[PDB]
Amino acid sequence: NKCDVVVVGGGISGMAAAKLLHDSGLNVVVLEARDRVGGRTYTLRNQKVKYVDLGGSYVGPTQNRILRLAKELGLETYKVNEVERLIHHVKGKSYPFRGPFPPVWNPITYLDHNNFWRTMDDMGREIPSDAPWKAPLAEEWDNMTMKELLDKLCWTESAKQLATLFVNLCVTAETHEVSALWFLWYVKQCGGTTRIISTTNGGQERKFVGGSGQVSERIMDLLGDRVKLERPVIYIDQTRENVLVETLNHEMYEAKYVISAIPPTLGMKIHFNPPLPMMRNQMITRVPLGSVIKCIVYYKEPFWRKKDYCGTMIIDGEEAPVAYTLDDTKPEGNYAAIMGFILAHKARKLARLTKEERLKKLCELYAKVLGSLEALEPVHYEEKNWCEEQYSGGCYTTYFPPGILTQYGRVLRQPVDRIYFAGTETATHWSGYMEGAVEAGERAAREILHAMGKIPEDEIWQSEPESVDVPAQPITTTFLERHLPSVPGLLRLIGLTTI
Amino acid sequence: NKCDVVVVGGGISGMAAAKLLHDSGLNVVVLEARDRVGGRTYTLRNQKVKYVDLGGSYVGPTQNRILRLAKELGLETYKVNEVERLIHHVKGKSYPFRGPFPPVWNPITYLDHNNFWRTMDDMGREIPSDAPWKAPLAEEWDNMTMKELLDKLCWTESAKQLATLFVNLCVTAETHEVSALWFLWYVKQCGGTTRIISTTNGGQERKFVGGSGQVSERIMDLLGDRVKLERPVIYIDQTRENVLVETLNHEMYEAKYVISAIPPTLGMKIHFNPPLPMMRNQMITRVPLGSVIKCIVYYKEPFWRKKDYCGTMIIDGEEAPVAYTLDDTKPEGNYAAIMGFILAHKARKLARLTKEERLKKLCELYAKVLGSLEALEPVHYEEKNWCEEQYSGGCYTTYFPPGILTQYGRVLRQPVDRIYFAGTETATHWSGYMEGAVEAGERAAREILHAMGKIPEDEIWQSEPESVDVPAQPITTTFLERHLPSVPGLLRLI
Ligand SMILES: *[C]C1=C([C])[C]=C2C(=[C]1)N([C][C]([O])[C]([O])[C]([O])[C]OP([O])(=O)OP([O])(=O)O[C][C]1O[C](N3[C]=NC4=C3N=[C]N=C4[N])[C]([O])[C]1[O])C1=NC(=O)[N]C(=O)C1=N2/[C]=[C]/[C]=N/[C]1[C][C]C2=C1[C]=[C][C]=C2[O]
Ligand SMILES: *[C]C1=C([C])[C]=[C@@]23C(=[C]1)N([C][C]([O])[C]([O])[C]([O])[C]OP([O])(=O)OP([O])(=O)O[C][C]1O[C](N4[C]=NC5=C4N=[C]N=C5[N])[C]([O])[C]1[O])C1=NC(=O)[N]C(=O)C1=N2/C3=[C]\[C]=N\[C]1[C][C]C2=C1[C]=[C][C]=C2[O]
C-alpha cells in the first residue's frame, strides 16, 4: 500500500533510483513485472557455463557511475581478452591485424575510410548531449536515415560496407531504419567513434566477475521486501492527492511520486488517468527497440589463442549470421567461449530456425573465419533472443526513426505531474548502456528529492569522479588523420591544379 | 462473463465484426475502452453545428462495404459541394480552376507534374494489395522514405512541393517519416491517385446525412447490452481452454475467440499470456499513427459560392496552418462551414496555441485565400486534435516507417492462436478508411466462422456488389498523359 516513491521497473535504472532514495531515508517500493530483477541484463548460472551474461555485459573507461555502483556492491571487473590479433573477414577471406582498427591499403579507400570516421566525430561535435534537437542542422540530419548519410559520405563500397556493419553492431538496427541525427548523437554521447568501438580503452574493455546481473540482484538484497516481483504495472492515477499505481495481479500502491524506469515505448502497457499530454502520448508509439540475438558457443579450450587470434572477429557479408565476436572465456582461462551477436534483420530471419540450427551455422562461420576445424566441436551453447521479451521489447536499446528525435525528443524526461523518468534512454552519457541506466536512475531520484525540498536545484545533475580501477586514456588523432582530404576533396584539388 | 466471441474495440471495425457474428447466431460481447462507440469517427451534436464529424467523414464510389452497411442501418449520403471553382493558392496568390487537378502552365513543369503522378500509379501496379512485401522491388522501395523518392523523381520544386502536400494530406505524416513502399501501396489499394484525391468520383464525394458516427451508434442499438462501455481491455490469457479477457474496471470475460479491432500499436496496452510471438511483439512498437487536427469554421452563409468558389482550397507553403479545405455546409445550404486539416508537424506546433488562436490563424488564411473579409467573421468553431487520444493514438491511420512493411508486414493479420485481427489497418481495399474498417471487420468475423466450421475456407474473403446509389466512373487517362516524356526523358531525347 503506502510509501514515498513507487519505482516502476527493477532494472539497473529502477534499482539505482531506489537505492539512492532509500539511502536518503525515504520509503520506496520497486514494482517489477518479471519474476526477477535485472531487466535487459540477465546472468544465467548452470554447471556448464558457471555464469554468463545473456544481456548487457561490457563496461569500460568513462563509465564511472556503473563502475562505482558496482564497486560499492562488492563486484570486480576483469579485462576482455585482446592480447592476440583481431580478424577482419571480408569477401570470404580473413585479414588478421593488431591495434583497434582494421588497416586499409588502397589509398583512395584509405582516404574514404579516414574521412567517414572523422566526419562522424565532426558532426557529433555540433550536437549537444543533453539536447540533440538543438544541433544547428538538427532538422536536416533528422530527416535523413543513416543509409542516406552513408550514401553521401562514402565514395567506396568498402567504407560503406564497414560503416553499415558499424551501425548494425552499434544500434541493432538497419541503416535505413534510423535517423542520422539520432545515431550521430548516440555515438557522440558515448565519447565518439573510437571510445564506442574499442575493447582496450573503450566500451568493451571489461566485464563483471560473476556477471552484470549481480548489480540488480545485490540492490534487491539491500532493499529486502521493498522489491515486488511479478507486479506488472497496468494503471496510474494522478487525479487525486496521492498517486495510485495499480498492478496486474491486483494490488494497489499509493505514493507521493512515481519513477518510470522502463523503455519509453513500454509506457504503452500502462493506462493513464488523466490521459498523458499529447506529445508523450504519441512519442511512446514512435520509439521501437532494435533486434538482436546474443549467442555464446563453448569450447574445451580457447583454441584461437594458439593461432595468435584473440577471438575478436569483424565479419562482413550478408551470408554471415554473426557480424561481430569477442572472446568470452573466464579470467581464469577456462570455459572457453566465443560471444557473437546476430543483428537487426538477421535476428528476425534466423529466429525461424532451431537453437541447434543456429549453433551449427555459427560453428561453420567461426571455422571458416578462424581457419580452424576445432570450431566445429562445441561443448555447450547458450543464446537469448531479446526480440521475444514483452517486458524489454528488444535490445540493446531504443532507436529513433527519421523525424522523431526533433519532434518528440524534448519530451522523454519531461516530468508528467508527479511521474519522473529514468531508464537508460533518458541518460545523457552512455545512454543505451548500463552506465546510462545508473545516470538516469540517480538523476530521476534526485529530481524528486528536489521536488520534496530536500536538495537544491543545482544538485539534480551531479558529475562523477573517474574510476581509479578503470582509468581512461584520452582519444588521440594524428596530424595526417586530421588533415588528409576526402575523396571529393582530392578530386577538387585535381580539378584545380588542372586549370 | 461467458460468450462465443469477445470483440475488443467498438469502432466501425469491431461493430461490423460483431453485427455479422450476432447475425449468424453467436453470442458476442464488445469491449470498448471509452464512454462511447465510433473510435476514430465521432459526431458531435449541439445547436450551433446541428451535427458535425470531427473524425472520419468522407465516403465515395468503390467503397461499397461502408455504403451498404450504412444503407442497411438507414443512413443516407449527400454530395460534398464541388459546383464552383477549386482554388490553388501558391506563393501567396490564388489560382482558381475547375476539373480535379490544378493546371500547370510552364511546359517543363507540366512534364514533371504529369510524370510524377504517372510514376506513382506505374509503381503501384507492381504492388499486390493483399501482400505489398511481395512487390518485385519491395526492399528497395521500403528502404527509402517518400522524401528520397520525391527527390529522385521531381525535377522541379513545384512538383516536389505539390507531391509533399499530397503526402501530408493523404497520410498525416511527413515525407521523410514514411516508407516509399508503404505509401505507394496505400495509394494503389485506394484505386490509384485520381480515385484517392478526387471529390467528384473519388474518396471525397460524399458524407453521411447526420454524421458517420451513426454507423457505430446504430450497431450498438441493434446489439443492446452486448456492448460494454468504459471497458479498456488490459489482459488476455490464452493458456487455458477458453480465452480469458480482463478489463481495467476489473471484469472478466470468457470466450472461444477474440477479435482485436484496435490500432496495431494499441495492442501494446494489453498484457499477454502466453507472451506474443517475437514478430508481433516487436511489430506493435514499430507502427505509429499520424498527427492531425480537424477544424471546422462556421459562417452565417456560404459566401465563397457567390464569388464562384466551391470551398476547396489547396494551399501551399510552410506558413499556412491548413493545407487543404473542403466545403462543410449541409445539403440544405445552411450551417455554412469550411473544414480544414492541420497536418503532420503543423499539428504538433499549433497544438501549443489556444482554440481561439487557432481560429484566428485560420480565418486570416481563408480571408487571404478566398480573398474575402467575410472569412474574418466566424459564427462558430469546432476542432479535434486526434494526437491527444490514448485510445486512438492519432489519425487518420497507421503509417509505416522505412524498412518496417517488409520485415513485419506479413504479421498484421496473422492470427495468434485464437486471437484474430480486424481494424482498418488490416484491410486490403481502402485500408486506413471507414471502408477498410468494414472489410477487416467482416473478414476477421468470417475467419472465426470458418475456424468454427460454419463456412468454407473460400468464403472468408467475400467480394462486394457495386452501390447503386454511389456508382463509380472508370479512371481515364489521355494519349498524351500516357506517352509524354519525363524531364530526364526529354533531356535524353536532346
Ligand atoms: C539486451 C542487451 C544485450 C543482449 C546486449 C547489450 C545490452 C542489452 N546493453 C543494454 C543494457 O542492458 C541496458 O542499457 C540496461 O540494462 C537498461 O536498463 P534500464 O534502463 O534499467 O531498463 P531495463 O533493464 O529494461 O529495466 C526495465 C525493468 O522494467 C520492467 N518492466 C517493464 N514493464 C513493466 C515493468 N515493471 C513493472 N511494470 C511494467 N509495466 C522490466 O521487466 C525490467 O526489469 C548493454 N549495456 C552495457 O552497458 N554493456 C553491454 O555489453 C550491453 N550489451 C550490449 C553490448 C554491445 N556492444 C557492442 C559490441 C561492439 C560495439 C557495440 C556497441 C557499439 C559499438 C560497438 O563497436
Ligand atoms: C481521426 C480521423 C480524421 C480526423 C479524419 C479522417 C479519418 C480519421 N479517417 C479514418 C477513419 O475514421 C478510420 O479508418 C476508422 O474510423 C477506423 O476504424 P477501426 O478500424 O474500427 O478502429 P477505431 O475507429 O480506431 O476503433 C478502435 C476502438 O477501440 C477502442 N480501444 C482502444 N484500445 C482499447 C479499446 N477498447 C477496449 N480495450 C482497449 N484496450 C477505441 O477506443 C475505439 O473505439 C477517415 N476515414 C474515411 O473513410 N473518411 C474520412 O474522411 C476519414 N477522415 C479522413 C479523411 C481525409 N481525407 C483527405 C482529404 C483529401 C485527401 C485525403 C486523403 C487522401 C487523399 C486526399 O486527396
Curated annotation (Swiss-Prot), chain A:
Provide one Gene Ontology biological process annotation: substantia nigra development
Q: What is the effect of changing C387A?
A: Complete loss of activity
Query: Topology in the membrane?
Result: Single-pass type IV membrane protein
**Residues annotated with S-8alpha-FAD cysteine modification:** C395
Q: What is the effect of changing C363S?
A: Complete loss of activity
The consequence of C3S is:
No loss of activity
Mutation: C387S; reported impact is: No loss of activity
Q: Does the keyword Oxidoreductase apply?
A: yes
User: Where, per UniProt, does this protein localize?
Assistant: Mitochondrion outer membrane
Q: Which residues lie on this side of the membrane: Cytoplasmic?
A: 1-487
Q: Which InterPro entries match?
A: Amino_oxidase, FAD/NAD-bd_sf, Flavin_amine_oxidase, Flavin_MAO
How activity is controlled: the entry says: Inhibited by deprenyl.
Instruction: Give the disulfide map.
Output: none
Q: Which Gene Ontology terms cover its molecular function?
A: electron transfer activity; flavin adenine dinucleotide binding; monoamine oxidase activity; primary methylamine oxidase activity
Q: Where is this site: Important for catalytic activity?
A: C154, C363, H380
**EC code:** 1.4.3.21, 1.4.3.4
**Gene3D superfamilies attached here?**
3.90.660.10, 6.10.250.130, FAD/NAD(P)-binding domain, Guanine Nucleotide Dissociation Inhibitor, domain 1
**Top-rank lineage group of the source organism:** Eukaryota
- One GO cellular component term noted in the UniProt record for this chain: mitochondrial envelope
Its UniProt entry gives the catalysed reaction(s) as: a secondary aliphatic amine + O2 + H2O = a primary amine + an aldehyde + H2O2; (R)-adrenaline + O2 + H2O = (R)-3,4-dihydroxymandelaldehyde + methylamine + H2O2; a primary methyl amine + O2 + H2O = an aldehyde + H2O2 + NH4(+); benzylamine + O2 + H2O = benzaldehyde + H2O2 + NH4(+)
The effect of C190S is:
No loss of activity
Please describe what this protein does. Catalyzes the oxidative deamination of primary and some secondary amines such as neurotransmitters, and exogenous amines including the tertiary amine, neurotoxin 1-methyl-4-phenyl-1,2,3,6-tetrahydropyridine (MPTP), with concomitant reduction of oxygen to hydrogen peroxide and participates in the metabolism of neuroactive and vasoactive amines in the central nervous system and peripheral tissues. Preferentially degrades benzylamine and phenylethylamine.
Record family assignment: Belongs to the flavin monoamine oxidase family.
On subunit structure and binding partners, the annotation says:
Monomer, homo- or heterodimer (containing two subunits of similar size). Each subunit contains a covalently bound flavin. Enzymatically active as monomer.
**What protein name applies here?**
Amine oxidase [flavin-containing] B
Q: Which organism is it from?
A: Homo sapiens (Human)
